[PDB]
Ligand binder design. Structure first.
Ligand SMILES: Nc1ccn([C@@H]2O[C@H](CO)[C@@H](O)[C@H]2O)c(=O)n1
Ligand code: NI
Ligand code: NI
Length: 332
């Protein structure tokens, strides 16, 4: 206001900020998947450090054993936590039922939308846009003109990555074959390994793994192949969610230390967890809203890493065309 004549002083010794307690509930696996779950957890840990908290004293994670465990994990979380993140589209129905039971608590669904629930915020990422950039990169480096995509679970979410990836590859060279295989799980490394083994055997020189912890198998297969060959015949992996450059270190057959990560799509799940936790604690929880992260706000990106200069220029050009609306990336 212009003036505030009726005012009273509050001494700093009497003032306090009321904190919140935040928990993530996993859709499958732990907080060491080197991707989705880990990004969320490092976010929550960073938030905890900023607020002088520690694990099980202000923040924690509940690992889900199956779909049947979602409801039980959310109900357990409601004992001590007043901000609860369902990390993954699979938690949709369970988060919806939990928010209706506990109208005094705040819930966040990561990667999916719940409508008409005042205590639920939804967060989506334009993974089609980051996928497109990964496709431009893949198309500018493949020598076999054959690339692979290993999906976790067939879904709207993984279809965004897949549609974006195909469109990006075709934007550079439509001749390039994309082999698509799904593991049917985000926590099945053994299946990631067999799919990657077959994709590489069928002549892919690059595999984009978009399957969470299932992707550990794709890294395992590419490492084994690359260790038993010369450096100049290595096959590539594209990283997902986190910059996975450090996961691609190996020694070739001819004793050269190298790296088989070409590029990584980024999905700033951690940053969203920290930002929404800060908003919940300040009493500004965005209940009932859908928060869309895209290339524009750097909620998704491509880490260029080991890409050729001509690759980086095609990526910069594709990014500019996505931001200005010149290129519309398909979501399916
Ligand atoms: N446990 C997991 C792991 C991953 N995902 C989805 O798969 C994408 C690639 O890791 C992630 O970005 C995410 O969309 C998931 O839904 N649940
Ligand atoms: Ni004023
Ligand atoms: Ni007064």
């Amino acid at each position: 206001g212009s003036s505030h004549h009726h005012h009273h002083h509050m001494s700093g010794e009497n003032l306090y900020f009321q904190g919140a307690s935040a928990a993530i509930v996993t859709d499958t696996g732990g907080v060491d998947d080197k991707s989705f779950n880990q990004s969320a957890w490092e976010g929550l840990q960073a938030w905890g450090k900023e607020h002088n908290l520690s694990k099980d004293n202000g923040f924690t994670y509940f690992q889900s054993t199956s779909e049947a465990d979602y409801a039980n994990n959310l109900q357990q979380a409601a004992g001590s936590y007043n901000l609860i993140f369902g990390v993954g589209f699979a938690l949709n129905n369970a988060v919806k039922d939990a928010a209706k039971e506990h109208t005094d608590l705040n819930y966040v669904l990561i990667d999916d939308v719940i409508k008409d629930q005042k205590n639920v915020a939804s967060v989506t990422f334009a993974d089609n846009e980051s996928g497109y950039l990964a496709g431009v990169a893949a198309a500018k480096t493949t020598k076999t003109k054959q690339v692979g995509f290993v999906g976790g679970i067939e879904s709207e979410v993984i279809s965004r990555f897949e549609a974006g990836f195909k469109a990006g590859v075709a934007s550079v060279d439509p001749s390039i074959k994309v082999q698509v295989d799904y593991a049917g799980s985000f926590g099945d490394a053994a299946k990631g390994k067999t799919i990657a083994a077959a994709q590489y055997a069928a002549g892919a020189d690059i595999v984009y793994q978009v399957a969470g912890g299932t992707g550990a198998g794709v890294f395992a297969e590419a490492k084994s192949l690359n260790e038993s060959r010369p450096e100049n015949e290595k096959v590539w992996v594209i990283g997902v969610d986190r910059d996975q450059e450090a996961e691609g270190k190996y020694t070739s057959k001819d004793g050269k230390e190298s790296n088989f990560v070409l590029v990584s799509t980024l999905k700033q799940v951690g940053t969203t967890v920290k930002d929404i936790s800060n908003k919940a604690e300040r009493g500004e929880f965005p209940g009932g809203q859908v928060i869309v992260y895209s290339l524009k706000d750097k909620g998704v990106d491509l880490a260029v890493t080991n890409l050729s200069e001509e690759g980086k220029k095609a990526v910069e050009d594709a990014k500019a065309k996505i931001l200005d609306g010149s290129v519309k990336v398909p979501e399916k």
